[PDB]
Design an enzyme around this catalytic site. Sequence first.
Site, PDB file in Angstrom:
ATOM      1  N   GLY A  43      13.456   8.591 -21.018  1.00 28.49           N
ATOM      2  CA  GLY A  43      14.218   7.899 -19.990  1.00 28.49           C
ATOM      3  C   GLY A  43      14.323   8.750 -18.737  1.00 28.49           C
ATOM      4  O   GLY A  43      13.382   8.790 -17.952  1.00 28.49           O
ATOM      5  N   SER A 110       8.059  12.446 -23.023  1.00 31.81           N
ATOM      6  CA  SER A 110       8.450  12.009 -21.690  1.00 31.81           C
ATOM      7  C   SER A 110       9.681  12.762 -21.212  1.00 31.81           C
ATOM      8  O   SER A 110       9.662  13.989 -21.173  1.00 31.81           O
ATOM      9  CB  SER A 110       8.716  10.514 -21.723  1.00 31.81           C
ATOM     10  N   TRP A 111      10.746  12.059 -20.826  1.00 32.25           N
ATOM     11  CA  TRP A 111      11.948  12.779 -20.408  1.00 32.25           C
ATOM     12  C   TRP A 111      12.351  13.676 -21.578  1.00 32.25           C
ATOM     13  O   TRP A 111      12.892  14.762 -21.387  1.00 32.25           O
ATOM     14  CB  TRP A 111      13.091  11.824 -20.062  1.00 32.25           C
ATOM     15  N   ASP A 265      -2.076   7.820 -18.915  1.00 32.65           N
ATOM     16  CA  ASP A 265      -0.625   7.732 -18.895  1.00 32.65           C
ATOM     17  C   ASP A 265      -0.296   7.557 -17.411  1.00 32.65           C
ATOM     18  O   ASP A 265      -0.554   8.450 -16.603  1.00 32.65           O
ATOM     19  CB  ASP A 265      -0.029   9.024 -19.453  1.00 32.65           C
TER      20      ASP A 265
HETATM   21  C1  LIG Z   1      10.057   8.284 -15.728  1.00 37.50           C
HETATM   22  N1  LIG Z   1      10.616   7.736 -17.012  1.00 37.50           N
HETATM   23  C2  LIG Z   1       9.629   8.066 -18.109  1.00 37.50           C
HETATM   24  C3  LIG Z   1      10.335   8.451 -19.416  1.00 37.50           C
HETATM   25  O1  LIG Z   1      10.959   9.494 -19.523  1.00 37.50           O
HETATM   26  C4  LIG Z   1      10.200   7.514 -20.534  1.00 37.50           C
HETATM   27  N2  LIG Z   1      10.360   6.170 -20.595  1.00 37.50           N
HETATM   28  N3  LIG Z   1      10.129   5.762 -21.823  1.00 37.50           N
HETATM   29  C5  LIG Z   1       9.812   6.819 -22.606  1.00 37.50           C
HETATM   30  C6  LIG Z   1       9.458   6.937 -24.066  1.00 37.50           C
HETATM   31  C7  LIG Z   1       7.941   6.852 -24.176  1.00 37.50           C
HETATM   32  C8  LIG Z   1       9.969   8.268 -24.630  1.00 37.50           C
HETATM   33  C9  LIG Z   1      10.089   5.780 -24.850  1.00 37.50           C
HETATM   34  O2  LIG Z   1       9.844   7.986 -21.817  1.00 37.50           O
END
Ligand SMILES: CNCC(=O)c1nnc(C(C)(C)C)o1
Length: 313
Positions: A43, A110-111, A265
């Site tokens: 997130g 990710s985050w 990605d």
């Molecule tokens: C910039 N926001 C990207 C992020 O951190 C993110 N959004 N969804 C995810 C998961 C793939 C971990 C579900 O990471």
Amino acid sequence: LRGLYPPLAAYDSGWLDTGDGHRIYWELSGNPNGKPAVFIHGGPGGGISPHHRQLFDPERYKVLLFDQRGCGRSRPHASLDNNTTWHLVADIERLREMAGVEQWLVFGGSWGSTLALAYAQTHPERVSEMVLRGIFTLRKQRLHWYYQDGASRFFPEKWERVLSILSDDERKDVIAAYRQRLTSADPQVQLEAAKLWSVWEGETVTLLPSRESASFGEDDFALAFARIENHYFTHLGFLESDDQLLRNVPLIRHIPAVIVHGRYDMACQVQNAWDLAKAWPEAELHIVEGAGHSYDEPGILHQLMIATDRFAG
Ligand SMILES: CNCC(=O)c1nnc(C(C)(C)C)o1
């Protein structure tokens, strides 16, 4: 291709009071005597799902999963008070003491990879190994790519929707523009912006389009997802430097790690994984061809399962 282990319920869960206005949800899954691990969701403000439990061998891992401040089952919902990278790092230590673990494996994408690095660099002593996916280090170049100009050129028809509510002047700084709407006293204004911002991400996180992307539009989820994400980005992740996370890799090079990142990605460019691998020779890098951002991209999931099984035997 390796897939997720079968579904299972958490063997325990609850809420932990932070003492500064937050009660964060956590749950323990797997083997109470197994190898300790902690799952960091993305997130920010993404929240955990039951499927994240299935990412680890049910009989070899003791997995602690939790919703970060303000999202999922953590209260107060969509709260931006005392919601920063460093509080979350603190929360992880708190959760660690409670679960009674001395040292655990940090799993984050990710985050989640961002907070994993920040955590690991703050408490190297508490991390046995790390499984990182879709590297995100919060550099301004990373935020510009996804929210100003970059991914927009691959999904111009979708980016047109994100810009639709903005005036010509606001379009020069989408993050800032959305920050105003997301922090408006009018909840209807907040939700309108929240939905647009969330769907943009929902529809660009997989190689191929999926119906699943519509769930990013649900009112409650979108509201907290957007507010929290936008909050953290508005404040550059609360880092001292643009490249603080890469600059402090020396502190964790001794830690066993695996990096999985989709070639296509669109949320986090492979460049980030490459930059990290360059500063971290010991780490095992895996650029998955034909994959997007999401953890469940067939090729990415395959490498993650193999990664967790490996560290558990
Ligand atoms: C910039 N926001 C990207 C992020 O951190 C993110 N959004 N969804 C995810 C998961 C793939 C971990 C579900 O990471």
